[PDB]
Scaffold this active site. Structure first.
Site, short mmCIF file in Angstrom:
data_model
loop_
_atom_site.label_atom_id
_atom_site.label_comp_id
_atom_site.label_asym_id
_atom_site.label_seq_id
_atom_site.Cartn_x
_atom_site.Cartn_y
_atom_site.Cartn_z
N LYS A 118 -39.17 -5.67 -48.93
CA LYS A 118 -38.93 -6.56 -47.80
C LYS A 118 -37.94 -5.97 -46.81
O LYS A 118 -38.13 -6.08 -45.61
CB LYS A 118 -38.40 -7.92 -48.24
N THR A 119 -36.87 -5.37 -47.33
CA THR A 119 -35.81 -4.83 -46.48
C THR A 119 -36.31 -3.66 -45.65
O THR A 119 -36.02 -3.56 -44.47
CB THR A 119 -34.63 -4.41 -47.35
N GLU A 162 -36.23 -10.94 -42.90
CA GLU A 162 -36.51 -10.90 -44.32
C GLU A 162 -36.48 -12.32 -44.88
O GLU A 162 -35.55 -13.09 -44.57
CB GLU A 162 -35.48 -10.02 -45.04
C1 LIG Z 1 -31.44 -12.89 -53.63
C2 LIG Z 1 -31.48 -11.71 -53.04
O1 LIG Z 1 -30.31 -11.18 -52.33
C3 LIG Z 1 -30.01 -11.73 -51.02
C4 LIG Z 1 -31.11 -11.57 -49.97
O2 LIG Z 1 -31.55 -10.22 -49.89
C5 LIG Z 1 -30.55 -12.03 -48.61
C6 LIG Z 1 -31.56 -11.90 -47.46
O3 LIG Z 1 -32.77 -12.60 -47.74
O4 LIG Z 1 -30.08 -13.39 -48.71
C7 LIG Z 1 -29.07 -13.64 -49.71
O5 LIG Z 1 -27.86 -12.92 -49.44
P1 LIG Z 1 -26.48 -13.67 -49.08
O6 LIG Z 1 -26.03 -13.16 -47.74
O7 LIG Z 1 -26.61 -15.18 -49.28
O8 LIG Z 1 -25.43 -13.23 -50.21
P2 LIG Z 1 -25.24 -11.83 -50.99
O9 LIG Z 1 -25.62 -10.66 -50.12
O10 LIG Z 1 -25.85 -11.95 -52.36
O11 LIG Z 1 -23.64 -11.91 -51.16
C8 LIG Z 1 -22.98 -13.15 -51.45
C9 LIG Z 1 -21.60 -13.20 -50.80
O12 LIG Z 1 -20.85 -14.34 -51.23
C10 LIG Z 1 -19.53 -13.94 -51.56
N1 LIG Z 1 -18.96 -14.85 -52.56
C11 LIG Z 1 -19.51 -14.94 -53.79
C12 LIG Z 1 -18.96 -15.82 -54.72
C13 LIG Z 1 -17.86 -16.58 -54.34
O13 LIG Z 1 -17.35 -17.38 -55.15
N2 LIG Z 1 -17.34 -16.48 -53.11
C14 LIG Z 1 -17.85 -15.63 -52.21
O14 LIG Z 1 -17.33 -15.56 -51.06
C15 LIG Z 1 -19.68 -12.52 -52.07
O15 LIG Z 1 -18.49 -11.77 -51.98
C16 LIG Z 1 -20.76 -11.98 -51.16
O16 LIG Z 1 -20.18 -11.44 -49.97
C17 LIG Z 1 -29.56 -13.20 -51.08
N3 LIG Z 1 -28.51 -13.35 -52.08
C18 LIG Z 1 -28.33 -14.61 -52.78
C19 LIG Z 1 -27.17 -14.76 -53.76
O17 LIG Z 1 -29.13 -15.54 -52.58
C20 LIG Z 1 -32.69 -10.90 -53.14
O18 LIG Z 1 -33.01 -10.13 -52.19
O19 LIG Z 1 -33.39 -10.98 -54.17
MG LIG Z 2 -35.39 -10.24 -54.73
#
Ligand SMILES: C=C(O[C@H]1[C@H](O)[C@@H](CO)O[C@H](OP(=O)(O)OP(=O)(O)OC[C@H]2O[C@@H](n3ccc(=O)[nH]c3=O)[C@H](O)[C@@H]2O)[C@@H]1NC(C)=O)C(=O)O
Ligand SMILES: [Mg+2]
Ligand SMILES: [Mg+2]
Length: 463
Positions: A118-119, A162
């Site tokens: 996807k990326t 994405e």
């Molecule tokens: C789930 C995936 O990873 C990605 C996906 O690629 C992208 C784009 O669609 O959206 C989501 O990123 P996102 O921007 O919500 O978060 P991530 O990139 O996982 O990072 C989470 C952020 O939260 C912060 N964080 C985490 C825990 C906490 O208590 N406090 C906090 O501030 C972490 O430090 C980090 O900076 C998906 N992550 C989650 C947890 O849902 C995947 O690709 O399979």
């Molecule tokens: Mg995934």
């Protein structure tokens, strides 16, 4: 693109997240005041702060002051002080994908979904549309390397995004065009082990397309082809399959570039030079080409973008060439963390590296995953010529006995194809590598955790 009624300041809990940060950047550049918190300060938060986002490290109820709406990452816990307080003050609290959906609302959205690719695909489509002078907005789950960022606000109506299936959150999205790259078992906790529920969810997702919408789906994925009758929207397929609407033929990899021909539905032949390795990337690029062709973009723009494609962050991410005491080496960083994806990376490397050695630095991500796919890890990791293992990147998990790096090393050693070296103090990684390096080694830093940061620290020191 209208302003959202009464939305002055948007607060992000977990603003440094890959998807979170892209959305924050879009909205910051639209002129909203942006605040956010994260437990970690890095390149992403620093960039956002420099642009004018108000970033706090650590979580505190005070951080939400002034927020019109709070956007929350799936990584955030329900006890989070900013989250609890937001709800108490009746401030709208929404998931990342709901805010992405609002970015998509008044735009011509191209949503890129699927388990893998996807990326890269999102980056490719983004670059094609950019080369076509369409000035798209994009929001990717990793770096678009030529942009040096995950997201960019364009002045047009186009949005390339994405689409994350991992929490069924892509159901918020209302795209004009939806790509599905593939479907394999992943994120099964959200689907409760049910592959059929995931299948149903993707169908639900494609049903968010307007009646005139387009689904672009990989012809080489049997699951995707079985789902076509259920789509109820125009489906265009791509791939190596003789039945693909956009069919790939004559694929060859030379160094780290791909060369192939795509045969279009009207039998138009397009000879592609793709600036990234692997048949898997030919597939990603053919999804991108199909989307562009169906949109009416000229071959010139498509071909130029694919020939110049600089890649997505951590997807066979070339870090450079380094002269070390024992040889000149090439360092590459890759996100692959499932055995099949690590296998794809090794294959792409092999097909570009001739008779020279592939050295891998592998960091397993999660004890749970290591446990669940242990034998598959043993087999795929045993394909490399030299192997350095890093300790499991726990990602919050308690250790599982028999599912650590020591256990993997034992089993791989005993298989006898490669003798792994476990490196626990990664400050020593460069020294261990220097000891084992031979001229012409390709060093693949592999995994989803801190291995990338570690490899970049290595690169920096070797400069
Ligand atoms: C789930 C995936 O990873 C990605 C996906 O690629 C992208 C784009 O669609 O959206 C989501 O990123 P996102 O921007 O919500 O978060 P991530 O990139 O996982 O990072 C989470 C952020 O939260 C912060 N964080 C985490 C825990 C906490 O208590 N406090 C906090 O501030 C972490 O430090 C980090 O900076 C998906 N992550 C989650 C947890 O849902 C995947 O690709 O399979
Ligand atoms: Mg995934
Ligand atoms: Mg071997």
């Amino acid at each position: 693109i209208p302003e959202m009624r009464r939305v002055q300041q948007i607060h992000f809990i977990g603003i440094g997240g890959a998807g979170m940060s892209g959305i924050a950047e879009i909205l910051l550049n639209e002129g909203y005041q942006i605040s956010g918190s994260d437990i970690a300060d890095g390149v992403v938060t620093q960039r956002l702060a420099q642009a004018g986002a108000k970033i706090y490290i650590g979580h505190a109820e005070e951080h939400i002051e002034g927020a019109s709406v709070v956007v929350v990452s799936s990584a955030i816990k329900d006890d989070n002080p900013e989250l609890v307080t937001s709800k108490q003050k009746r401030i709208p609290v929404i998931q990342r994908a709901q805010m992405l959906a609002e970015i998509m609302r008044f735009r011509h959205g191209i949503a890129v979904a699927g388990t893998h690719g996807k990326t890269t695909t999102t980056a490719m489509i983004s670059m094609i549309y950019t080369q076509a002078k369409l000035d798209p907005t994009f929001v990717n789950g990793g770096l678009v390397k030529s942009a040096g960022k995950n997201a960019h606000l364009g002045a047009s109506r186009y949005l390339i995004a994405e689409a994350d299936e991992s929490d069924a959150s892509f159901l918020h999205l209302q795209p004009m065009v939806s790509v599905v790259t593939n479907m394999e078992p992943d994120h099964m906790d959200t689907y409760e082990g049910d592959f059929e529920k995931m299948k149903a969810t993707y169908v639900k997702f494609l049903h968010n397309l307007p009646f005139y919408g387009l689904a672009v789906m990989c012809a080489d994925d049997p699951v995707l082809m079985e789902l076509v009758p259920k789509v109820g929207r125009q489906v265009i397929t791509y791939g190596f399959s003789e039945q693909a609407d956009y069919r790939i033929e004559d694929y060859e990899q030379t160094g780290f570039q791909g060369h192939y021909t795509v045969i279009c539905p009207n039998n138009e032949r397009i000879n592609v030079l793709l600036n990234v390795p692997g048949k898997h990337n030919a597939l990603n690029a053919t999804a991108a080409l199909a989307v562009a062709k169906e949109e009416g973009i000229a071959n010139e723009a498509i071909l130029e973008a694919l020939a110049d494609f600089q890649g997505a962050g951590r997807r066979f991410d070339q870090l450079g060439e380094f002269i070390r005491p024992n040889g000149k080496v090439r360092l590459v960083d890759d996100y692959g963390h499932h055995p099949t994806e690590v296998g794809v990376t090794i294959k792409a490397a092999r097909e570009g590296w001739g008779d020279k050695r592939i050295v891998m630095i592998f960091q397993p991500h999660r004890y749970s995953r290591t446990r669940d796919l242990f034998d598959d890890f043993v087999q795929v990791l045993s394909q490399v010529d030299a192997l350095i293992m890093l300790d499991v990147y726990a990602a919050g998990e308690a250790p599982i006995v028999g599912a650590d790096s020591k256990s993997l090393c034992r089993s791989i050693r005993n298989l006898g194809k490669v003798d792994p070296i476990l490196v626990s103090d990664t400050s020593q990684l460069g020294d261990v590598l220097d000891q084992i390096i031979q001229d012409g080694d390709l060093i693949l830093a592999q995994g989803a955790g801190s291995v990338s940061k570690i490899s970049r620290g290595l690169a920096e020191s070797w400069k």
